[PDB]
């Protein structure tokens, strides 16, 4: 009864360097040092910086153009850094995208504006619409709040003044209102959560404050009004007189309590203290990894891992049976578009790459976020002249699905194939949201992209919000919002020259050669190719009647059928409900359809830019401008896919939303691509022949007949070795003294 | 290092008798004996019977009316048998639904026609449209085939004559054509599969034969024509002259080979011979079962299992936290509606309860169809005066999902809850189809109903079928078909008096009290109740914008919000594409919408009847007739749900369709039903607090801290104990001599 051998993944070396992953620590250090030695940039370190300096917002690898990468992979691009500067030594503060290279840093190294990969052509510059993060509080919000401190005490026994005794918090909208040169704020009071709980987004208080914060001089900012209980007041005097008048309606606060906390609560059900089932890996990891080149192979699949600050995880050069199917697959942006009868919730339209997925891709809880036997990679990100490493933030694992891949029974025999699949997973927790992203690979050739949501909802005050959600607590509205997450799928099916084919199942009344002048009500296939970008923005059909295929017309199979891959919403999807959003303007045009196809260009690498929110009337990347009538008939196309959900939170979203139901996914599956089903090549299948009450034969096809043992420790033990974020200072470069 | 204790499920006793499950062996024996002792019925045993006798098609428990069951459960119905007779001692053969009772069988026992639970009111009688199964071959098809034996030899080196040397097979349509009193057949030649392979449905040959088979006298049947390569011939002479003419196009057969077989084939991928991950249950089964009353409890859930010949598995009295949410949940019928440029495939519209799900609910392969630690129940069915028991054909198991239930991270702590859920599963294999049905229960209160499909597709000959599928092999078309499977969901939310509410997310341009004469492009909730059956047949909205809730308006929560359950297509769904199908006529009106709500009646227990196919112009149950303008405002309603798929098989459906992508599901989740998320009551969650590079606290909430060991045997060992179908003769009743 020998122990099972839980062997780690195989150590292999990727055939090519990983030209996408990111900067090495040294490179990032060299570039930082170089940038500070450029007096024209006149940069200050974060530690020394305040609100009126020039600082380094980001230093990362500039990803090479596909036209550079493909000849390196198929037949080594010079590395360059992408740098972002926050220039606040000015009354017109701005963000600046630049290129620093060539690397390694040398006398030959230069910098220049970067405007190639953006649709806005402004030398990589966009305004910084929130340059006074501190001053907006100390010289404005807190002063205004002190104007009504007596009122906030009477309403909720609280104050927000900027002191230790503060029991209230003030914040509002994203993006800020950007009508006609002006920059306008709508803010709300919130109750604070108890110490060591993250429940503030469940504690709105319902008093709103409109501010014109145009310019960086607080003596020129104006108080445009207040709102409470659906009544508007132009001035503070008018609100104060109304408040203390007899008959004034005072509404209750939301106060923190067990209801808003994630701890165990309520009756423990029968037998739940016993161990639930646990997935184990008797032979360990049945895949191969290059840890240095962040490269993975599993069965017939291989791919490279990439990771940035904006969108976190990304996959490159995804191949199947030695042949590329996707040059690039990755998150592009996440939208959280709200609506409400109040101005704060009405105005929220989060574009998460502003905050970044990479910085909040924290370490996973082993055994919970992924199975215990999963292999775990690191990810890092640059901020504040520091490299932050999130230890064990990616996970990789095989998983035996609760249902088999295939089967067939008869009166004489039964056969079944197991469904063993591979998953690459990341989880980013941006403030209150927990997005869990998963990339699946299956033995039938199916690639899956999924997202699930959990964490805290961004709540809304109950008062008069009947048309925009449910009341789910004493003074709480669940509110409403659309999640829309855009993914870039650069399919290069049997080469770059591809076409989108729509294969539709549609009703027809039809006559036939055997019908005899009679007709029959039946159905038919309707086939058409998307010819141009003019007709390339579409939605999933009524009754799922239209299938969408990415094919290569120049590589048909032996039956004249173009080889390709079907894209289907396996777990359901949804695009933005709001038409011509007032919040977004031009900032998220990708959110308007489920499936969008454009011709590939190296000057259109991403569907978004992190600071689209800074200038919604003229964003760096305006996705709309990608559509200029280019041909999509056997050219290099990119399929842009939205995963998404319509979320009207109910009482079951308290304390947190659950991953079971907050779910959205698409799947890429072979379509007339192979001679047959490739899952049949697995040994992990069986055929039992049977008669007269017993099995006569059991064919197991060369799979393991191993008998072995495992000792199961409680996974919670490993939780004690949770460390979190490992910081290394990069200027001055001090890699031997990490800290937290 | 003590071994893990894999304890079986707890033995409990259900609070009430299981009034739905089925007849006991003795009852079934007593009823058979009784029926044969009724000379008015003049019945012959199957062993003695041919085509011109009266036989017993079915003996089963007549399920009691809900009006009888509810007072027994909430405050014991007399048992009656439902019997079906195949009366073929007549030139107008017919099926007869009757009631035999009361039970136990005594002098008081009687029989009578049963027409209460059918919409057709014809004393439970419907014609038998296929009474001459044997004669249709020996006196017709084989004689006609011998007429062209020389041609079938030249075309495919084969013959169908009714001999041992037969290499071809002949069969065709379901239902048979039923225009204007006549009964018409369209049949096709098929190639036979090799010995011990089930691949015939992949081997069409493309020669078609139209026959008028009206009446039971073969000398009055007529040969209406032939079809081949899209050319029609009215007579055999005309076809024979055309065939042997110079220039006649002869098209190739589909012949069996590895391509059509399910055995392992192709390159075994890297590391696949190693053991894949395996789910184990360290503490065994964390649920409770009454084996005698077929009753299950898991955590906060409980339900009764029922099982019949027509639709197989069914659930009754599904309760949550001691309160009923569904009186009944179960498969009602499965449609397989095809289309093609040929008459056989054009005419196929299978209604599977004719064949029955219960007879083909074969024993599962342990470790493959379900996890190895699953508990396995039996199911049985009556046929041919015999009780057939399918050993270990139901399975029950917990499963730790590959993703957690909920999580939330901060810079100071992380918390996660596991997603451990319960599954009840059955698999029916009707001829070539393998339907795997699964009922899921989750710790958030979510109930899931799923189907996946695998097995062999019913193929189509390639010739001239371009508009109705792909060519996927040398002479093979994948064809096309809609799967539509109807489920009855009798929600009784906090009592029988319920209402359907549609909560929709829709765009609006809106003015506000804080807007200042400006409007904003936003979105809003749109709420409406379904008032009547006139407006109760609907489809899932555009962009998933409309949520469907089953609520009780008379039991609102403390915030005025009606308590209920959301129904959502979690895994995607689809209804029948074909409008006013010529194949179906009135036989499957439930297939026409995704979601259909009717008022509950005991005289409408099922949406279908097995022999709807026998009289498509006047079926026993015509679902359309359920809709007669009855109020659905706070009355007892039934939600009828379709799971389904549009399936245009491609090359990856060879040899079999795969469960990964052939998938469809709905989910019932609490909606403003509880004060909060009930998943938080589980101990199987964790919270890690962390700082300065280490975890300061790990709260595990009273879950298992067990360290134990398991020996893992290869599951294939248990496969040798596969026995299959255990038959016991019920007339003469001989329970001590079972056989196969
Ligand atoms: C190289 O970088 C340095 C900074 O790293 C930069 O010096 C900074 O210049 C900014 C102005 O661009 C200074 O900010 C001002 O400081 C003064 C005095 O302390 C304040 O009074 C100013 O605020 C008032 O006036 C503003 C309008 O002019 C209003 O908008 C504002 O609300 C106030 O009323 C303003 O904050 C900053 O202090 C210096 N820092 C240092 C260390 O000198 C320098 O100019 C750059 N070099 C070049 C060549 O550009
Ligand atoms: C009680 O049940 C028994 C059967 O269990 C029943 O006797 C059966 O009657 C049927 C007729 O209803 C008989 O079937 C016929 O048999 C004759 C002679 O063998 C055949 O020639 C007949 O077939 C020809 O004629 C038919 C039209 O009349 C044509 O449709 C057909 O194509 C043929 O040309 C026909 O098959 C059957 O043989 C008997 N069986 C026995 C054992 O007697 C009996 O009538 C029932 N009792 C009562 C009171 O109803
Ligand atoms: C769209 O792309 C396809 C490329 O396959 C073009 O069709 C091919 O055209 C060549 C001649 O240039 C033929 O020899 C091939 O047989 C064609 N293949 C198929 C499958 O049709 C097509 O012409 C292009 N459309 C336009 C408008 O240029
Ligand atoms: C539809 O059903 C609801 C049952 O709740 C009816 O509304 C209730 O009517 C009673 C009076 O009969 C009131 O006292 C309740 O307050 C009502 N409740 C709600 C939530 O409105 C309603 O009248 C019925 N509709 C019709 C047309 O009869
Ligand atoms: C905080 O202290 C200030 C100054 O004394 C006071 O005005 C305010 O009421 C205090 N806040 C609270 C919540 O008591
Ligand atoms: C992740 O980073 C930590 C801290 O730098 C390091 O100790 C560890 O080796 C890294 N993980 C791997 C797999 O190399
Ligand atoms: C969107 O709305 C704005 C103002 O509401 C209007 O000026 C503009 O024309 C609209 N855009 C479109 C594309 O309809
Ligand atoms: C079967 O035997 C018959 C009678 O001899 C003959 O006509 C026919 O050709 C045989 N079938 C085949 C497939 O050879
Ligand atoms: C299933 O039926 C078989 C054959 O009658 C019997 O031996 C076995 O005990 C049954 N299973 C259970 C769990 O009782
Ligand atoms: C369905 O079609 C038949 C014949 O094609 C026709 O007689 C009938 O009116 C149609 N029914 C409906 C509801 O349109
Ligand atoms: Ca373009
Ligand atoms: Ca491409
Ligand atoms: Ca009715
Ligand atoms: Ca009901
Ligand atoms: Cu949400
Ligand atoms: Cu199918």
From TrEMBL, chains A, B:
The record's InterPro entries line, in alphabetical order, gives: Cu_amine_oxidase, Cu_amine_oxidase_C, Cu_amine_oxidase_C_sf, Cu_amine_oxidase_N-reg, DUF1965
The residues listed in the UniProt record as binding Ca(2+) 1, with positions renumbered to this chain, are 490-492, 636-637
- Which GO biological process categories is it annotated with? amine metabolic process; peptide cross-linking; peptidyl-lysine oxidation
Report the SS bond pairs: 4-708, 370-395
* Positions contributing to Cu(2+) binding: 481, 483, 647
Which EC numbers does the record give?
1.4.3.-
Record-listed Ca(2+) 2 binding positions: 533, 626, 628, 630
List the active-site residues: 352 (proton acceptor), 433 (schiff-base intermediate with substrate)
The cofactor(s) it depends on are: Cu cation
Modified positions (2',4',5'-topaquinone) are 433
The record places domain DUF1965 at: 199-267
Per UniProt, the keywords (alphabetical) are: Calcium, Copper, Metal-binding, Oxidoreductase, Signal, TPQ
Q: Which family does it belong to?
A: Belongs to the copper/topaquinone oxidase family.
Protein name according to UniProt:
Amine oxidase
Give the source species.
Answer: Emericella nidulans (strain FGSC A4 / ATCC 38163 / CBS 112.46 / NRRL 194 / M139) (Aspergillus nidulans)
